[PDB]
Design a protein around this ligand. Structure first.
Ligand SMILES: CC(=O)SCCNC(=O)CCNC(=O)[C@H](O)C(C)(C)COP(=O)(O)OP(=O)(O)OC[C@H]1O[C@@H](n2cnc3c(N)ncnc32)[C@H](O)[C@@H]1OP(=O)(O)O
Ligand SMILES: *C(=O)CCCC[C@@H]1SC[C@@H]2NC(=O)N[C@@H]21
Lengths: 507, 91
């Protein structure tokens, strides 16, 4: 047997991975293999595989047997491009020891993590694992620690995207907590530390696999997964589209792409969206879609914390991040869940030089013991902090309500904002007329007459604008034109801040 | 228009260049009736639509050449977006 024959035989096995029968089962369950997923994700022919001939070195517990020698050791690693842009990937292969993590497994992932940080290219992981490989014991625990160290080091340096394409258990479930976005596949992917078998054995509770850690749970209730997609093919198609929004590294400006949508057009549809009656809700998404280039908007966590909307869009070719209230849900109030999603999004966009647009319509905070005992104070500070420390352009437009401390939390101008616009329907006050007048004229006669005078003078955006809180009051139809003008001149903005080892977020 | 065919052709063009979005409209019905062979010839009675659409309105039916044009347009537009997606300012 020549060396070339041995090489060819290893190449053929590396492509089969766990073997054809395993691959057959992989398809029966409705899943693609790790290599098929990469072929879909990356530009055709752009993928270059690294370390395809690496095998484990563990000899204990029968691991020295030829039957266990799977080239690639359960991960496919390499580099490629999406639409001409460099990206690093890795994908875990469930058909080889269940996708469990070995020492060598982690080493290969770390290698990719180090090349991407050095050059400044994003890393996209496709995760699917049964947890640690117990045959090696403590070697796999060091594997996790090294991966975690790279994921922390890369934070704020390169984007880190993690798409879950199957179950994930043990220590593996923490890597999506360190990356920037986590995506899942409905009814296929899971995120949990221990399985239902442990829950039943430890405590007298009955739960199944989907209830414990299914995609629907994490995208609707726990707030862990940013979005779930119907199947593997649609998940990777949307991932390519998402990729096109982000810079390659935090040293780069927000990408600018060819755009055919005139930057100076008006949107007459905005003038009548906001009702004159204060108790009538409207859909904030109608405003967002009409302003953004070609009416394309990428919504994050559509089913979690619906009272606040965050997502990506482009204006005049440039990627921007959008944050705003949704008056349809809980009157547009802030609560614990909305502050968590908001602060996380704002901080990512600031780290990677993506401008922020804020659409404010917030009457205050969600009251009640459910929020008080939940630490609403500690959690609300997260969104205020995320805006106050931002150094990227911030353009705020107030569409209607801004009462109380929520005015400042939703990126008010006095938090180093660049511009602040009000629509004619905006009203900025410490509280509404009823509270303010009954408190001011407490115990006085003819309070209702005093309220009429108070409403005429203060129930409008003018007592704030004349003091410098608002830069202009614009016809809503011109909102897009005004924002476009600001974005194209604030893009060269640079500011300094006192040196600090690191930031200290309230948590 | 100056004649019966000019006014009908111009109507067909106006309907395809008439943008209504946000509600459900009846342009599909108007665009097919005006091009119906009985309408162009004039064999129209007050119960015309009830005999042409005895089972309800189904939408415009494509022939062989029209399906090829629709497939070619949809495929070329798909690629046009795929090519635009690759044109970045050079970093
Ligand atoms: C406390 C901590 O954080 S450390 C957690 C430790 N994690 C683990 O060891 C895995 C957790 N438990 C399991 O093994 C579960 O079976 C899970 C998590 C892998 C999920 O199970 P499933 O998705 O149903 O996969 P399943 O175990 O049925 O797969 C069977 C095959 O995968 C492999 N496999 C399954 N579990 C493991 C494992 N823990 N380690 C190594 N290989 C495994 C087996 O070789 C088996 O071979 P087969 O093809 O002949 O069946
Ligand atoms: C009527 O009972 C007044 C309700 C308070 C209006 C809303 S609800 C939560 C916000 N907090 C606040 O003081 N105003 C807002």
């Amino acid at each position: 047997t020549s060396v070339n024959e041995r090489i060819e035989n290893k190449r053929r096995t590396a492509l089969l991975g766990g073997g054809q029968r395993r691959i057959d089962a992989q398809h029966k369950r409705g899943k693609l293999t790790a290599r098929e997923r990469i072929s879909l994700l990356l530009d055709p022919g752009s993928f270059v595989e690294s370390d395809m001939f690496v095998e484990h070195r563990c000899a204990d517990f029968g691991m020295a047997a030829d039957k266990n020698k799977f080239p690639g050791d359960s991960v496919v690693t390499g580099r490629g491009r999406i639409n001409g842009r460099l990206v690093y990937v890795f994908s875990q292969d469930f058909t080889v020891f269940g996708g469990s993590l070995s020492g060598a497994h982690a080493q290969k992932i770390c290698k990719i993590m180090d090349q991407a940080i050095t050059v400044g290219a994003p890393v996209i992981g496709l995760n699917d694992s049964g947890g640690a490989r117990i045959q090696e014991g403590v070697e796999s625990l060091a594997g996790y620690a090294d991966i975690f160290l790279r994921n922390v080091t890369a934070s704020g340096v390169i984007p880190q995207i993690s798409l879950i394409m199957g179950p994930c258990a043990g220590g593996a479930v923490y890597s999506p907590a360190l990356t920037d976005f986590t995506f899942m596949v409905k009814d296929t992917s899971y995120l949990f530390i221990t399985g239902p078998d442990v829950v039943k054995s430890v405590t007298n509770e009955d739960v199944t696999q989907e209830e414990l850690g299914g995609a629907k749970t994490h995208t609707t209730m726990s707030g862990v997964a940013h979005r779930a997609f119907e199947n593997d093919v649609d998940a990777l198609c949307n991932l390519r589209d998402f990729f096109n929004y982000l810079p390659l590294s935090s040293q780069d400006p927000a990408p600018v792409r060819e755009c055919h949508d005139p930057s100076d057009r008006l949107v007459p549809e905005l003038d009548t969206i906001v009702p004159l009656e204060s108790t009538k809700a409207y859909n904030m998404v109608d405003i967002i879609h009409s302003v953004v280039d070609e009416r394309e908007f990428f919504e994050i966590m559509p089913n979690y914390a619906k009272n606040i909307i965050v997502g990506f869009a482009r204006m005049n070719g440039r990627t921007v991040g959008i944050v705003g209230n949704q008056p349809k849900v809980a009157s547009g109030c802030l609560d614990i869940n909305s502050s968590v999603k908001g602060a996380r999004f704002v901080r990512f966009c600031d780290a990677f030089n993506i401008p922020l647009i804020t659409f404010v319509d917030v009457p205050g905070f969600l009251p009640g013991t459910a929020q008080e005992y939940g630490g609403i104070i500690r959690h609300g500070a997260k969104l205020l902090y995320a805006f106050a420390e931002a150094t990227v352009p911030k353009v705020t437009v107030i569409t209607r309500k801004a009462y109380g401390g929520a005015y400042d939390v939703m990126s008010s101008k006095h938090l180093c904002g660049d511009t602040n616009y009000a629509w004619p329907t905006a009203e900025i006050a410490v509280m509404g007329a009823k509270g303010a007048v009954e408190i001011i004229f407490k115990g006085h006669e003819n309070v209702e007459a005093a309220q009429a005078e108070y409403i005429e003078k203060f129930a409008n955006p003018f007592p704030a604008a004349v003091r410098g809180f608002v830069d202009d009051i614009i016809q809503p139809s011109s909102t897009r034109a005004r924002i476009c003008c600001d974005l194209d001149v604030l893009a060269s903005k640079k500011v300094q801040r006192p040196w600090r080892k690191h930031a200290n977020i309230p948590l | 228009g100056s004649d019966r065919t000019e006014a009908l052709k111009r109507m067909a063009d106006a309907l395809d260049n008439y943008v209504i979005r946000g509600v459900t409209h009846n342009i599909a019905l108007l665009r097919e009736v005006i091009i119906n062979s009985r309408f162009v010839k004039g064999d129209i009675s007050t119960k015309f639509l009830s005999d042409v659409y005895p089972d309800g309105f189904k939408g415009h039916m494509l022939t062989k050449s029209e399906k090829n044009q629709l497939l070619a347009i949809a495929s070329s537009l798909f690629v046009a977006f795929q090519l635009r997606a690759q044109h970045f300012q050079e970093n």
